[PDB]
Amino acid sequence: YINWRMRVTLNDGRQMTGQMLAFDKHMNLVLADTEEFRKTKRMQAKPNSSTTQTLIQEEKRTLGLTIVRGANIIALSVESPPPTLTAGPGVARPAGRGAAAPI
Amino acid sequence: AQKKKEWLRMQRNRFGEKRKGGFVETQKADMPPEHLRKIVKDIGDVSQKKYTSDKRSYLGALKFMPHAVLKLLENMPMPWEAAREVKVLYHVNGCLTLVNEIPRVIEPVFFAQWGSMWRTMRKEKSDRRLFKRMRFPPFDDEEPPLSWSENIEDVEPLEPIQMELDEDEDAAVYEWFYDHQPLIDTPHVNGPSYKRWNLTLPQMANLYRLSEPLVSDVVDPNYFYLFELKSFLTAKALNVAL
Amino acid sequence: TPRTSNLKAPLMELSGHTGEIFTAKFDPTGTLIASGSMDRTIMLWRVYGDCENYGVLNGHKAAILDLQWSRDGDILFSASADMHLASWDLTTGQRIRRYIGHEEIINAMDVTQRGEELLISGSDDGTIGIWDPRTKNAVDYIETDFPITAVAVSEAGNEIYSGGIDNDIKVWDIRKKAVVHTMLGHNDTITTLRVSPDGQQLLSYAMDSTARTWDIRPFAPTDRHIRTFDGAPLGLEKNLIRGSWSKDGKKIAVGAGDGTVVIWGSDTGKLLYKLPGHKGTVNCAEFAPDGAPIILSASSDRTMLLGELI
Amino acid sequence: TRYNIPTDGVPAGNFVLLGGVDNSIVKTATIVDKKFDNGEDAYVFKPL
Amino acid sequence: MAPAQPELKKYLDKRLFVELNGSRRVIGVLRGYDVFLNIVLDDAVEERPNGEKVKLGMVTIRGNSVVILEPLE
Amino acid sequence: DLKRTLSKLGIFLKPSQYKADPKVLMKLVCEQFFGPSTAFVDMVIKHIPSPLEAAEKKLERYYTGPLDTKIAESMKNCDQNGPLVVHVTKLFNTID
Amino acid sequence: MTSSIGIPIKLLNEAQGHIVTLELTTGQTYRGKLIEAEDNMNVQLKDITVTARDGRVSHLEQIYIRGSHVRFFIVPDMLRNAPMFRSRNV
Amino acid sequence: WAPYPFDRRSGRMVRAQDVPLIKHWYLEHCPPKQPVKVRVSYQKLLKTYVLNELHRKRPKSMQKQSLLRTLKQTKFFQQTTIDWVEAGLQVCRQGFNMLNLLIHRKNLTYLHLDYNFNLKPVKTLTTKERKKSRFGNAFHLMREILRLTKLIVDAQVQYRLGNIDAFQLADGIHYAFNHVGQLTGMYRYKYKLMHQIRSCKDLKHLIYYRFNTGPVGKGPGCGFWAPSWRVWLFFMRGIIP
Amino acid sequence: PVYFDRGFMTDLMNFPEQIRNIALAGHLHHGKTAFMDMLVLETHAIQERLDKRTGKKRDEQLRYTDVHVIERDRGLSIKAAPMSLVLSSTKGKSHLFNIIDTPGHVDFVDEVAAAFRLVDGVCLVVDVVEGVQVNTEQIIKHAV
RNA sequence: UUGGAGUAGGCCAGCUCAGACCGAACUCAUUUCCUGCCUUUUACCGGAUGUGACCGUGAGUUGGCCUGAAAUACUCCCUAAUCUUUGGAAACUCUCUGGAUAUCCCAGAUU
Fold this sequence. Notes:
Chain E: Keywords: mRNA processing, mRNA splicing, Nucleus, Ribonucleoprotein, RNA-binding, Spliceosome. The structure is cut from a larger assembly and holds 1 copy of chain A (about 100 residues), 2 copies of chain B, 1 copy of chain C (about 300 residues), 3 copies of chain D, 1 copy of chain E (about 70 residues) and 1 copy of chain G (about 90 residues). Chain E has about 70 residues and is an all-beta fold. Chain E contains no helices and 5 strands. Chain E is about 0% helix and about 55% strand. Chain E has a 5-stranded antiparallel β-sheet, with no helix packed on it. In chain G, strands 1, 2, 3, 4, 5, 6 and 7 form a 7-stranded antiparallel β-sheet that branches. Chain G has one helix at about 5-15, and strands spanning about 20-25, 30-35, 45, 50, 55-60, 65, 70-75.
């Protein structure tokens, strides 16, 4: 299941998307090109509307190559998959189709 | 139903995996030795008129006789063999008999066998009183050639030159030392084609001990200082001699 | 009007097989050529340019009698008289895998061009095997009582066009594993069933030297037989002649046993061409799928003639 | 030794092989930039 | 097999501050340790968030109880 | 017997390799017993200084300029972003 | 049998001497040059610039952290192409 | 610490002639207290080794079909397994009948070719008979090669008949291979052959001076015939084309 | 083809604290190039080409850093030959080693002297049977 | 350990590659020269320089033969007692900060 672009969910609710490079026996996962996205719920109150809208703002920070312990790892989901003809003895010669044949 | 039978038969007789070429093909086999024996006996010296069709070919096989001489003398029996059998490729007129073999040996085994020959011949020459050398040529000129069947076919041969191997000291090679192709039916060679060998440490030690009169006692390569090939080539290029 | 195409010569003779060619197919973009022949070999050529034999595929233990291309043209599909199917990779020239489960000689096969990927093999034990091109085991197989020499997949992907030595085209359904209906009318052993590119006509040449075009459409009379073209007599050998359609569905090209490939007009039944050029029987006569006037005729002269239709 | 790996840059404190420069070295040499950033002088290492 | 012992031989008999769970601080001198990070220290002074230092003397902290450590010398 | 003994220690070889010549079998056995040259790497790391810890000594011994200049600090700390200085001593002839 | 350590533990062990950022489970992340490592991920750092999620930025020297409280670790990019990642096919 | 191949425990088989049993005798320094003839034999053998090494070639053989394997593919050649002595007797009779048919086809029946391969006129020849009969170097070189082959085969046959013992057989084989110039006129039709003759004498010197040492006396008895046999095999290799 | 990555090796040039520059030095035929062959055969994938050798060249020592024709024919090193390698410590951490093989003959020892200007450490290879000889004394005296 | 991929040993024959060392061994012919011996030519002498043939070799692949094995077993590639998995968990409130700002609510932090 290595080298597949996946997103893993941490125990603190933070998501990490990237290419899974290696995994161990205790599920300690080392992944490269990691982007940590946190979906924090914020109650933004408009100046004209009295109802405050609860929006899940996603803050994304690029970390790079990160190794995470398996005790704080919760779950992961795959996002995207991964991203000798020898020459024979044949020859080609122009030719002609020969004499016309009766029906 | 006749259509199904004839279609299946046609399809098999055209696309079966035994007829890739149109005919059932086999591997060329070995005739009895008595076939060649009868042919050579029948043609004799080519003096009957029956074999007038066989004369042009026979005289034309003169061209390949040198090559037969090479193969015959190459596959000669060694002194420890009373007799040897060889595969021959023979012409069906009896014109040519080419020995179809390569005298392929294990180098430690061959080297030790010939070293034991050196020992045995020296001991016998020290033990014999008067050594009668054989006459050359062995047979008088006007004698007809010896037929195999009447003269040699059933005759028990004499004892070959072999050394009295000690049963206890030479127990590694005792049972196979003087066989024709030693260890051919063992897990010590790849098979009957006899092309790779492996020998255990006791066997290699025993073969090293038996080859003492021949094997080299030089261990240090520094023994060959200024007496190696590059030194001889340098001395040749310089018109000097070591 | 000397020459109107992209080939560097109006005729090219592709040679290099040491045995009789039985099939030859085009890449569905009209760019690559695959020919399987009785010397157990699939030779892979370019059609545009200097036309080098860029590849040879070995690995069948007996005569090769069919091959289709994939959707893109990256995986080849070879049926062979070693009772086997095989899927081949053209990125490396190696073999992906072999499909096993037939007991006698395999004559036909078909890949579903669009729909879901299935290989459809007619084999002389009396079987029509439906295979998935990822597992070597047969997904299913339909039992008949006669050898099958012809097979085509429907446009809807569930009807099977079998043709046996029992002299009639049978349309089966995969789900019920039973024959839907038989277009009878032929007198001799069926060889090729190729659906029309639009999908309403079926070409069928049999050993009686007559090539008939039939209906495919669900609304049709009792006799679905459109036309019986004649003019391509079959020779001495009882080969499995493989005809084809043009891209526009207007021209019918079938090889013949005199070395001549015969093209009729599918609309009316007029002999458009009677192109000579071969010594033995012509086994596989095909059009260019791109729509160019390129025709290919692979014959058991160990040769292929790649020519033009001006 | 058996071969050479061509690269666009060899950093400080390492071993380097330079080609196109040999015309002036006779026993030992010190290779520096054309002009320093502060316009300072240049000094040589001790002879071997 | 048996887990590897922590690399704290240079930290022996030195002033160290250990932060433990409950946001507690312990300032002391290292006296010994074990494979399971059971640290025994002498002249320990415990500090809560109020900043009050209470002397305890010889104290022991388990491996799970120990969170962070830092040498004071 | 060799298979039994080396499996008793925990060294495993393919059965074709157990029948090799004594010198090559010896090389394979010692290679799988001792392993790679990590001990030499450890010895060099522990007992031989890095360029950062030896460049000051190199400047003190074999450099004829003053040590208070910025070029001296650049040579001493082995910075990449400093100006170029290379001490060339050896000359190797090319392939031709 | 022979005990096989994880590839991620090997990448942590090979990261010694380069600056890495370790964030514990307490919300505090310290970035500094790692000076040691262990099989139980108990790492000691020397530069240790610490930032706590309550907003506390500080600097400390020679701080040792056990592997239990350590949540995430980020190492240098060069070790992304390390010799460990090559699939050995003997 | 044994020399090759005694420090190995696995290997490939070599041909029997491709084992030089005494090459290290002259590849090493000569022992002290030698006769001058033995020393110059050592030097001559070393010269042959050096000149073989200097003219080592790289012919790039790929266009070579075997004679025996191509002959096996026909209907006119079959295969069997027979005794070596039977094959030698057959080869000698075949070559004799071939030369006899050639002589009789040219209507030269006044020349008798006897069974030891000597061509002698049965009567006094005229000038035209002598002119028509003079044979060539191909006939005569083949006839003397056949004569040496006959000598070797009759040595083996005399062993197989009980007339000589095995030590006598090995001694006779060594004698025949060391006395080709005396027992044949084979040098008459190819004089470069004398090189081979010289080589055999050189080997004999070495062999004798290590054989007749100690209680071993003089005269016949030396059956160490392998190196001379090798020399004549390599001659036949070159003389075949 | 080697068993490390050249991009990884170039990136480990970028960290000059984990780099060691050493010179292998010692007497004639005491095993400097044999040591370097050990390192090379650990890193480079050239066992496949060496296992195809036959004849007397099957017994030839590789001698990767003997490349002058003098060195191949005389059988001794005459030029200080440099290499760069990636070698792994017991902790699994890879290090870039810039090593110099020096000649051991008592005449080419100036090459040794040249290498002793360039390196930070001296790995002195000494035979256990012959022990310390005159060039070992000269190299030890200089490096001390 | 698993999935899928597979398939025995010996011998025989074809084809392609290999000279660096195919060969731990070793012959012959020959072009252009130099030299020896020679009345002439063949046959020779012995160094250079190339160029051919022969006796053999290895690896890959393809077809067949022999004997077994019989959908077998084997092989291939790959990964509940202190620090990662048998949870000090769960639950809610208080206080503080921000948005709203009269409150409810929510985020974050703490008990």
